[PDB]
């Protein structure tokens, strides 16, 4: 974590092996709300979530 | 005569609330209540 | 780029139609739609009645950023469709809610 | 033909004017998904196979 | 982290909001400087 | 109307200190510490 | 895992007690390994001791 200066951000849940056996395959479809109110800090957050 | 001045002095305190509930929204966006207030602006204007 | 009026009715019509292509190659398994948005004044009750009357589709609603828009309708959509609700206010909150 | 290096997408463009020197961004997590019609020269008599 | 039992261990800060430029910090439950917690510190805060 | 001759005196001091402060201070504050070879400005956590 | 193995450290967080293992070097793993127990990876923003 802190003994070098590179720090791991590894999560088991995130892992592909973990995910395929977590659940079944899926057809998803991301909707993004692009109305005017979102512009600002919130719009910035959405692009990084998707 | 007497309340004619005060029926339109009561009208304008209703207009001041009608500007104080307008919720400004960024980049040309709206909600339902600002779309029923812009009609109200028309109603207020006619009386004056 | 953000601009314009929010419409959850044309947003979920376009989503369901996308979900029903059946000409293309598809997974055909869990069918789910997730919307990222801040606040909603409309629950769009009508679109869900028909497009997913039997709840085949799962809806996940995400409320993001620090804001004052109403979250009750979005939570309701998530509850109605057997999905879930997730807030994200921050960048460090993205990593455990988009995997959850 | 399959190799240890990850399969790459696009032409890599990094901006040197906006990497502060000591913060350590994510490296990689993608799977190495090379396809059979990309490990070898493609035919029509190999898409049949 | 809303309470003290959870406010332990380390966390990330992001510099200029880039989600790629991050650094560990230990998190710690800090009390405010000027606060209202007895009559004495409540008069200290009010003066300011 | 009594505070007229005061307001005129504030205005010949906001002008005087501006042309003094132009002639002395013009164009001096355009240099900052930058990370080597970046456009990223370098600070400590609580420094503007 | 991801903790200093130096004996003189002795952090000793509450609830937990660590192990100093002995770490033979190996083939089929191209790293030093211990066959007497399993390591534990906790991700970084997750506190251990919760
Ligand atoms: C007198 C009139 C009241 C003015 C308001 C002063 C009240 C401030 C006070 O009550 O001090 C409380 C202060 C807070 O202590 P605390 O925040 O808990 O910190 C713990 C240790 N760090 O606890 C303290 O440890 C500080 C106590 C310092 C006492 C303040 C000194 C006052 C001296 C003023 C005399 C000047 C008289 C001039 C009058 C002219 C006014 C027009
Ligand atoms: Ca909106």
Cα D46 from chain centroid? Answer: 23
Are the C-beta atoms of residues E47 and A25 closer than 8 Å to each other? no
Distance CA D24, CA D30 (A): 18
Distance CA C88, CA C97 (A): 7
Are the C-beta atoms of residues G48 and E8 closer than 8 Å to each other? no
Among all chains, which residue has been given the structure tokens 């059946």? C22
Contacts of A34 in chain C (CB under 8 A): 1-4
Are the C-beta atoms of residues C63 and C71 closer than 8 Å to each other? yes
Distance CA G7, CA D44 (A): 64
Q: Nearest to residue E45, comparing CAs of C23, C62, C71, E37?
A: E37
Return the half-sphere exposure (C-beta side, CA atoms, 13 A cut-off) of residue F41: 8
Return the bridge partners of A20, or none: none
Q: What string of DSSP letters covers C58-88?
A: EEEEEEESS--S--HHHHHHHHHTT-EEEEE
Q: Contacts by B29-32 with C-beta closer than 8 Å and gap 24+?
A: B29/A35, B29/A36, B29/A37, B29/C4, B29/C5, B29/C6, B30/C5, B31/C41, B32/C41, B32/C42
Phi, psi angles (nearest 5°) of residue G48:
-105, 140
Are the C-beta atoms of residues C53 and C28 closer than 8 Å to each other? no
Does the beta carbon of E22 sit less than 6 angstroms from any atom of ligand 1? Answer: no
Contacts of A43 in chain C (CB under 8 A): 2
Atom of ligand 1 nearest to the CA of E35: 17
Q: Provide the token pair at C34.
A: 């997730």
Are the C-beta atoms of residues A6 and E24 closer than 8 Å to each other? no
Q: Nearest to residue C9, comparing CAs of C94, C99, C97, C77?
A: C77
CA distances from C23 to A29, C19, C20, C27 (A): 17, 11, 9, 12
- Using a CB–CB cut-off of 8 Å, the residues of E that contact C are 11-12, 14, 17, 19
Residues 6+ apart with CB under 8 A from C22: none
- Angle (deg, nearest 10), helices F16-25 and F4-14: 10
Neighbours of G17 (CB within 10 A): 7
Q: From the CB coordinates, do chains F and B have 3 or more pairs under 8 Å?
A: no
Distance CA C93, CA C63 (A): 12
Distance A28 CA to ligand 2 centre (A): 22
Which residue has a Cα nearest atom 18 of ligand 1? Answer: E41
Residue C49 three-state SS? helix
Among all chains, which residue has been given the structure tokens 């033979």? G24
Residues 6+ apart with CB under 8 A from G35: G24
Q: Nearest to residue E12, comparing CAs of E26, E2, E24?
A: E24
The enclosing H or E element of E12 equals: strand E10-14
Does the beta carbon of E48 sit less than 6 angstroms from any atom of ligand 1? Answer: no
- E: neighbours with 3+ CB pairs under 8 Å? A, C, D, G
Are the C-beta atoms of residues E8 and E27 closer than 8 Å to each other? yes
Q: Which DSSP symbol is given to E6?
A: T
- Method used experimentally: cryo-EM
- G: neighbours with 3+ CB pairs under 8 Å? A, E
Q: From the CB coordinates, do chains A and G have 3 or more pairs under 8 Å?
A: yes
Are the C-beta atoms of residues C67 and A43 closer than 8 Å to each other? no
Distance CA C8, CA C14 (A): 10
Are the C-beta atoms of residues E10 and G45 closer than 8 Å to each other? yes
R_g (Cα) of chain G, nearest Å: 13
Distance CA C32, CA C60 (A): 8
């Amino acid at each position: 974590s802190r003994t070098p200066n590179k720090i791991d951000l590894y999560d088991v849940r995130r892992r592909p092996w973990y995910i395929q056996g977590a659940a079944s395959p899926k057809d998803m479809l991301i909707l993004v709300d692009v109305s005017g109110s979102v512009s600002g800090l919130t719009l910035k957050l959405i692009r990084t979530s998707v | 005569w007497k309340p004619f001045e005060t029926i339109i002095l009561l009208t304008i305190f209703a207009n001041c609330v009608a500007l104080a509930v307008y919720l400004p929204m960024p980049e040309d966006d709206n909600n339902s209540l600002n779309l029923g207030l812009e009609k109200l602006e028309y109603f207020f204007l006619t009386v004056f | 780029t953000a601009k314009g009026i929010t419409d959850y009715k044309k947003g979920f019509s376009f989503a369901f139609e996308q979900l029903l292509n059946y000409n293309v190659s598809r997974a055909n398994c869990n069918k789910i739609i997730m919307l990222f948005t801040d606040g909603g004044e409309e629950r769009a009750q009508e679109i869900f009645a028909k497009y997913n009357k039997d709840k085949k589709v799962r809806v996940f609603t995400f409320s993001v950023g620090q804001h004052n828009y109403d979250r009750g309708p979005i939570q309701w959509m998530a509850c109605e469709n057997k999905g879930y609700y997730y807030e994200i206010p921050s960048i460090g909150a993205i990593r455990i809610n988009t995997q959850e | 033909n399959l190799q240890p290096k990850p399969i790459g997408v696009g032409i890599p463009t990094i901006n040197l004017r906006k990497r502060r020197p000591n913060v350590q961004n994510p490296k990689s997590q993608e799977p190495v998904t090379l396809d059979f019609l990309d490990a070898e020269l493609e035919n029509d008599i190999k898409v049949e196979i | 982290k809303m309470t003290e039992e959870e406010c332990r261990g380390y966390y990330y800060v992001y510099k200029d909001g880039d989600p790629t430029q991050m650094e560990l910090r230990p998190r710690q439950w800090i009390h405010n400087d000027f606060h209202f917690d007895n009559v004495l510190s409540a008069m200290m805060s009010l003066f300011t | 109307l009594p505070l007229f001759h005061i307001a005129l005196l504030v205005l010949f001091m906001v002008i005087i200190y501006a042309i003094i402060g132009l002639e002395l201070f013009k164009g001096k504050m355009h240099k900052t510490c930058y990370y080597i070879g970046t456009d990223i400005v370098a600070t400590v956590e609580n420094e503007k | 895992a991801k903790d200093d193995l130096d004996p003189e450290k002795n952090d000793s967080e509450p609830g937990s007690q660590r192990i100093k293992p002995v770490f033979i070097d190996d083939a089929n793993f191209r790293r030093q390994v211990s066959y007497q127990h399993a390591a534990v990876h906790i991700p970084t923003d997750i506190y251990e001791g919760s």
